[PDB]
From Swiss-Prot:
A GO MF label: pheromone activity
Record keywords, A-Z: Disulfide bond, Pheromone, Secreted, Signal
Annotated S-S bridges: 3-19, 10-37, 15-27
Subunit: Homodimer.
Record-given protein name: Mating pheromone Er-10
Subcellular location: Secreted
Length: 38
């Protein structure tokens, strides 16, 4: 959903805005990894 989408499409904003505080690190912390989204 919007949360997953923020991981998949590399959206820091969404990773804070759409994802919950639990998924937040899971999403953003993952997205911020240049191995996935440089």
């Amino acid at each position: 959903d919007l949360c997953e989408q923020s991981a998949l499409q590399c959206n820091e904003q969404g990773c804070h805005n759409f994802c919950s505080p639990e998924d937040k690190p899971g999403c953003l912390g993952m997205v911020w990894n240049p191995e996935l989204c440089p």
